[PDB]
Design an enzyme around this catalytic site. Structure first.
Site, PDB file in Angstrom:
ATOM      1  N   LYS A  78       0.609  -0.745  -0.269  1.00  0.00           N
ATOM      2  CA  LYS A  78       0.274  -0.654   0.096  1.00  0.00           C
ATOM      3  C   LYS A  78       0.319   1.159   0.022  1.00  0.00           C
ATOM      4  CE  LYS A  78      -4.107  -0.111   0.536  1.00  0.00           C
ATOM      5  NZ  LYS A  78      -5.642  -0.279  -0.628  1.00  0.00           N
ATOM      6  N   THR A 129      -3.855  -5.187   0.733  1.00  0.00           N
ATOM      7  CA  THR A 129      -3.302  -4.098   0.483  1.00  0.00           C
ATOM      8  C   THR A 129      -4.447  -3.310   1.410  1.00  0.00           C
ATOM      9  OG1 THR A 129      -4.219  -2.769  -1.740  1.00  0.00           O
ATOM     10  CG2 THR A 129      -2.031  -4.494  -1.302  1.00  0.00           C
ATOM     11  N   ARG A 185      30.541  32.886  -8.677  1.00  0.00           N
ATOM     12  CA  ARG A 185      29.207  32.322  -9.168  1.00  0.00           C
ATOM     13  C   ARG A 185      27.965  32.308  -7.968  1.00  0.00           C
ATOM     14  NH1 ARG A 185      29.114  26.597 -11.351  1.00  0.00           N
ATOM     15  NH2 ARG A 185      30.050  25.331  -8.949  1.00  0.00           N
ATOM     16  N   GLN A 231      30.940  18.967  -6.186  1.00  0.00           N
ATOM     17  CA  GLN A 231      31.652  18.117  -6.252  1.00  0.00           C
ATOM     18  C   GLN A 231      32.227  18.102  -4.377  1.00  0.00           C
ATOM     19  OE1 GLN A 231      31.253  19.108  -8.751  1.00  0.00           O
ATOM     20  NE2 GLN A 231      31.559  17.177 -10.835  1.00  0.00           N
ATOM     21  N   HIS A 258      20.964  26.281 -11.931  1.00  0.00           N
ATOM     22  CA  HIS A 258      21.953  27.073 -12.512  1.00  0.00           C
ATOM     23  C   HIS A 258      21.173  28.945 -13.019  1.00  0.00           C
ATOM     24  CE1 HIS A 258      24.219  24.173 -13.939  1.00  0.00           C
ATOM     25  NE2 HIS A 258      23.205  23.404 -14.505  1.00  0.00           N
TER      26      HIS A 258
HETATM   27  O1  LIG Z   1      29.464  22.768  -9.336  1.00  0.00           O
HETATM   28  C1  LIG Z   1      30.136  21.702 -10.804  1.00  0.00           C
HETATM   29  N1  LIG Z   1      30.431  21.396 -11.397  1.00  0.00           N
HETATM   30  C2  LIG Z   1      30.152  20.594 -12.039  1.00  0.00           C
HETATM   31  O2  LIG Z   1      30.600  19.575 -12.652  1.00  0.00           O
HETATM   32  C3  LIG Z   1      30.388  21.372 -12.842  1.00  0.00           C
HETATM   33  N2  LIG Z   1      30.130  20.765 -14.793  1.00  0.00           N
HETATM   34  N3  LIG Z   1      28.980  22.784 -14.933  1.00  0.00           N
HETATM   35  N4  LIG Z   1      29.374  23.033 -13.827  1.00  0.00           N
HETATM   36  C4  LIG Z   1      29.634  23.178 -12.546  1.00  0.00           C
HETATM   37  N5  LIG Z   1      29.557  23.275 -11.960  1.00  0.00           N
HETATM   38  O1  LIG Z   2      -5.901  -7.058  -7.064  1.00  0.00           O
HETATM   39  C1  LIG Z   2      -6.092  -7.342  -6.021  1.00  0.00           C
HETATM   40  N1  LIG Z   2      -4.342  -7.488  -5.018  1.00  0.00           N
HETATM   41  C2  LIG Z   2      -4.277  -7.219  -3.860  1.00  0.00           C
HETATM   42  O2  LIG Z   2      -3.214  -7.357  -3.526  1.00  0.00           O
HETATM   43  C3  LIG Z   2      -5.430  -6.600  -3.396  1.00  0.00           C
HETATM   44  N2  LIG Z   2      -5.404  -6.275  -2.189  1.00  0.00           N
HETATM   45  N3  LIG Z   2      -6.158  -4.895  -1.695  1.00  0.00           N
HETATM   46  N4  LIG Z   2      -7.459  -5.462  -2.841  1.00  0.00           N
HETATM   47  C4  LIG Z   2      -6.097  -5.992  -3.853  1.00  0.00           C
HETATM   48  N5  LIG Z   2      -6.653  -6.205  -4.835  1.00  0.00           N
END
Ligand SMILES: O=c1[nH]c(=O)c2nn[nH]c2[nH]1
Ligand SMILES: O=c1[nH]c(=O)c2nn[nH]c2[nH]1
Ligand SMILES: O=c1[nH]c(=O)c2nn[nH]c2[nH]1
Ligand SMILES: O=c1[nH]c(=O)c2nn[nH]c2[nH]1
Ligand code: NA
Ligand code: NA
Ligand code: NA
Ligand code: NA
Lengths: 295, 295, 295, 295
Positions: free
Chosen positions: B10, B57, B176, B228, B256
């Site tokens: 779920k 579920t 920058r 990096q 950017h």
């Molecule tokens: O900080 C950066 N890392 C990168 O790898 C990079 N590539 N273009 N600009 C960048 N700036």
């Molecule tokens: O098709 C279903 N599968 C499930 O496992 C399920 N659980 N509740 N309703 C459901 N319907």
């Protein structure tokens, strides 16, 4: 057929600007997204393929950058007014400019207690927005707003006494969760032009802060009878603290959290006063709106 | 054809839980989204339509609520372990449980200085996550992580000395903008079972705080030679502060911000040392990954 | 501390290419999003700030455009292989290239019956994807996939005979709605290098079509005993129609549609055989996965 | 302070309905998302905490399901009118109902040539929408629309002859890519009430089909002088084919695809007539709007 209305321009223009204090070393960043739509004597571009009337949307984008280079970008109410005024003044046949600005949060980092000179964090998706409409001959209409302010309180909210009929299953409650995303807009008195807007510059930031503070306090402290009733109290207070605002609008989702009955399993008690585990509901949601003005 | 691997369960189970201190009145909320996938002797449900082997579920979702009702939900490393253990212990033919938890921020509001007893704000889309794999006979493997931590610094970043050939246009720079969304994962020593996990409970919150603090400080203070090089320094420090971590992984976009040449307009100077207005780039982006471990 | 793993490159590179038949006037468009990550002898960029080893991510983006200019972009399995090979051949110290390509749909419009020479529609958010891993000395590993194929059937689905215990509320059913978003991946035999990939070029498009056709027919015609059982049948058939595929994986959400009991209102009958109006559930959802291979 | 405007109700209500032909076995599914906002004499819920006036949003959601159970859901113009009418007729103090419906595509699968009786595919994110405003005493105002129709043409688009000044860098072109997401709305003559709407029922589907067909043909065949000029032609034609429409609105993004100059690399030619590889731009974008009516 005839052209009843027309507007055109550039949407989603991302702009960053940095200010550098040379004396202290401290930098301040502003980032926005800007939309500009123009109206005027442009019908012939639609009806006769006459492009001579079109200020190209590419050129509108250039102007936005140039204007931000030459002028303050804060407060956004002033930047928006300067940008909209430029278009109605520069182009004879353009008679209205509609400027929308979304401001993004870049909040100064605190590092080991103290504020860092050039490092920022996006502490929330909350936005500060403006809509500025600049209309040749009819001044400048500013709507300022906050949006994306997401809050929740776990108690001190009620909802009882509503209409019950044959379409009603909802039970009355004296204690529930209330959670919302706040959209709040405050609409300024019409301004005569840029000189008047400049004369009110300190009031834009101060009123955005008041609005946000009132929304927060009221939500937290109100023993709420309904979203309707709580939002009214917020709107009333803002109007009372700023005389140049004509209307306050709020639009609030009611984001439901449901009780989960577990009693089918070993008689486990998880409802009413025993509720601890709840299921947040993604949809549907309550949607409550108000516009409040002066008597 | 044969079943080489199979898992089911779920996803997207939203859970809220409130804790109420009866003495002080103070409430604390936790909200998560939980995923549980199970493996074991279930091949026949696929190959022979034998549903007898399937824990529905829907039942998995019930268990999640019941478990949260009966147990702490914090720290998520402990909740995840309890939830995964339950399935391998309860069902003979289930031999592995994979639990993913995303924790959402509900930060206590401060109102007029002081912390509100039952009001919260979503101050950021940053998440705290866990992946817990509970495998019958082979213990509990926990990967803890933060994600969605969006930061920017306006200066003190460089990128020069890279390989230049006939595919290279990029210019070297000594100043920058650097902006990223931090995804950082720290992988725990294998734990023998729930008793061992319980014995380390204070270390989960403390290590998440250290990781976040190291990421922030290092980003702010490093005069960065590359993404990096900066990320390495973060990973090295975390490993040194927590002996029960075997590996640290970082995955960092390089978001950017481009200079905008305005010199075509009235010779306006907006590049190199004159850059004030920049264009944030939505795409493409640099994507830099590292896994660092012990010598 | 030591670098246990490292990869870096350029994500979210949007590429459009047009082909023009000069004789017929007919144009054909291709649009993709491409990611390239490289590995090799690059540890020193992380540990010693040695940028001399880095092929800049900006240069990687240039290469992508240049390669698309000089080579076919279809099928994406061939384009991916050519792009990954380029990096391991060109740079002595680069030993692996990981290429992900998402293909977007631009489907030729039919206008008044007949196919338009240069007009296209995005008829669905369904994607065709590839992951190509090019590893120096160890050939080319291609995983091909479709994703975002959203289907629904209103009847001829069942789910009964599952394990019932004290965590079970779900009722058995002999007639339900089944709706899913299909993620299906088929993994190719390792290829020795680009010559071998080229020799299989007609099989990539043909197998993507078979996969899609089998998924569709099987979903429509199977009187389904479970998602598990229906997906198995799809995977079995694909393996049988293409001998160069080693494994088929399926990952299927079960997007629930709930009955709505209206009997509290005027005894209205909307359950079991009387069900006409249903509530689509946004979350949670069932998540069912299988990998099927050869005996 | 006073309440100048107020509306409230339920948003994001997901509804599925199946129709079963008992004679042929053929099933037909409809899935929508529905929003209902009400106005009337409700000010006191805001100002005095008087919940007695509130039809709970939970009850609004119940009504939506009940109405869909008892009435056709197609065409959405008729369903919307029935739903809005219900609220103004049932509640004395409610005087207006605003109904928004988004219709999702469930397109019958073809399997081995022929249409499957109960299997469907989501062949596109294109929506058919309606806004119905039902105002007590003033009839029913219907705006019908399509949205999310994404198209592209690779040639037969031009943009030359626009205003050039000192803010202009854009070059004139006689051959470019044009790509947009079509939002088109057609506004109906006011209807006196539900009887009149029922009397026009065959015209709603037929006009949606005409609108879509005109948008498609015009886009494909127009040798376009601008977005402005192409959209006008679409709007003119719709107005001419359906006399009960008062206005047609179009709102069209211009989703830019940029040429990439590769000549810095080995003199490669990829501009002007040599352009084959282009870079799709995510932002900013041109935004062009028109409302066309009758002379
Ligand atoms: O900080 C950066 N890392 C990168 O790898 C990079 N590539 N273009 N600009 C960048 N700036
Ligand atoms: O098709 C279903 N599968 C499930 O496992 C399920 N659980 N509740 N309703 C459901 N319907
Ligand atoms: O605060 C509320 N306002 C409402 O109008 C409503 N309707 N259902 N629940 C509700 N809660
Ligand atoms: O079709 C166009 N209309 C416009 O108004 C425009 N502006 N720049 N490019 C454009 N293309
Ligand atoms: Na003007
Ligand atoms: Na077990
Ligand atoms: Na190599
Ligand atoms: Na009424």
């Amino acid at each position: 057929s005839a052209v009843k209305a027309a507007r055109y321009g550039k949407d989603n223009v991302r702009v960053y600007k940095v200010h550098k204090d040379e004396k202290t070393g401290v930098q301040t960043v502003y980032e926005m997204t800007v939309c500009v739509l123009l109206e005027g004597e442009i019908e012939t571009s639609y009806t006769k393929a006459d492009n001579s009337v079109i200020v190209a949307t590419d050129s509108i984008k250039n102007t936005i950058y140039i204007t931000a280079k030459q002028n303050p970008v804060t407060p956004p109410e002033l930047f928006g007014s300067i940008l909209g005024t430029h278009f109605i003044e520069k182009y004879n046949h353009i008679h209205a400019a509609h400027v929308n600005i979304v401001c993004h949060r870049w909040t100064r980092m605190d590092i080991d207690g103290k504020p860092h000179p050039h490092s920022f964090i996006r502490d929330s998706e909350e936005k500060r927005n403006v809509q500025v409409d600049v209309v040749e001959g009819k001044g400048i209409d500013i709507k300022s707003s906050l949006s994306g302010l997401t809050v929740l309180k776990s108690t001190n909210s009620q909802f009882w006494g509503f209409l019950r009929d044959e379409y009603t299953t909802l039970k009355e409650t004296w204690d529930r969760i209330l959670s919302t995303d706040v959209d709040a807009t405050w609409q300024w008195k019409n301004f005569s032009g840029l000189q008047e807007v400049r004369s009110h510059v300190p009031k834009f930031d101060a009123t955005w802060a008041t609005a946000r503070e009132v929304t927060l306090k009221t939500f937290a402290e109100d023993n709420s009878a309904s979203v309707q009733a709580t939002m009214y109290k917020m709107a009333e207070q803002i109007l009372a603290r700023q005389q140049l605002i004509e209307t306050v609008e709020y639009s609030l989702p009611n984001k439901h959290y449901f009780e989960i009955d577990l009693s089918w399993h070993k008689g486990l008690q998880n409802t009413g006063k025993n509720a601890e585990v709840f299921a947040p509901q993604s949809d549907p949601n309550g949607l409550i709106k108000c516009t409040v003005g002066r008597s």
